[PDB]
């Protein structure tokens, strides 16, 4: 990406900045950590390693920010079901159907 | 949005599902709550009232999931600076330049 990130531009997993003299590289890593390297030595980081960071973005309100991926606060825990559909029924029950039958409901 | 959500669909915020007879509704609300209405009475909730909940999805894995918006973990704390640019400099400093001059650096 060069040595500059302007308002509304962002770094994503794998991408980076590099100084003109090619000595330093700042890169947002897949372990989620934004790390600056002097050659192959890390000299500074966002300490966000082990987090799921998706982007490091120079925002248009002038703020540079790292965002973690959207996380699940609630689920039906039916992962593994095939051909699911959720149906709000006339009997007032909400039901998650699956190829192999009703997978979930309110009750 | 009909009475059904299949594989890879979801309710956006303010989106919903309604019953055939039309008696019952299920909306994902702006307060981030997924509520089920029977006319004027709320009968069931996801308890996500007060959360940045962006969508409720019927996923390909058969799991029906509510997601909250991407969270901030780190920032330069420079909200308000104008015409910003982050620069990786040859001296190995990293600076955020704003219209007014350097706003932030390592």
């Amino acid at each position: 990406m060069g040595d500059t990130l302007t308002a509304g531009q962002k770094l994503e997993r794998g991408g980076s900045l590099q100084s003109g003299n090619g000595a330093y590289t700042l890169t947002l890593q897949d372990d989620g950590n934004l790390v600056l390297y002097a050659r192959d030595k890390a000299v500074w980081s966002t300490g966000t390693n082990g987090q799921d960071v998706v982007r490091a973005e120079v925002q248009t309100d002038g703020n540079f920010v790292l965002y973690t991926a959207e996380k699940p606060v609630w689920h039906t825990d039916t992962k593994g079901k095939k051909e699911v559909k959720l149906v709000l029924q006339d009997d007032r029950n909400l039901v998650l159907y699956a190829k192999d039958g009703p997978a979930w409901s309110l009750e």
Side-chain angles (χ1 to χ4, degrees), chain A residues 74-76 78 84-98 101-107:
Chain A
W74 186 101
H75 78 316
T76 196
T78 48
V84 290
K85 65 187 192 148
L86 185 69
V87 184
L88 174 67
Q89 299 185 321
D90 288 336
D91 65 0
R92 199 181 82 191
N93 195 12
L94 174 65
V95 177
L96 189 75
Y97 287 106
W104 178 95
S105 80
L106 248 30
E107 239 59 12

Side-chain angles (χ1 to χ4, degrees), chain A residues 43-62:
Chain A
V43 307
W44 168 102
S45 82
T46 48
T48 51
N49 58 303
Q51 309 193 210
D52 198 15
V53 168
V54 58
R55 71 170 186 295
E57 159 155 30
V58 188
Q59 276 171 36
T60 179
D61 65 52

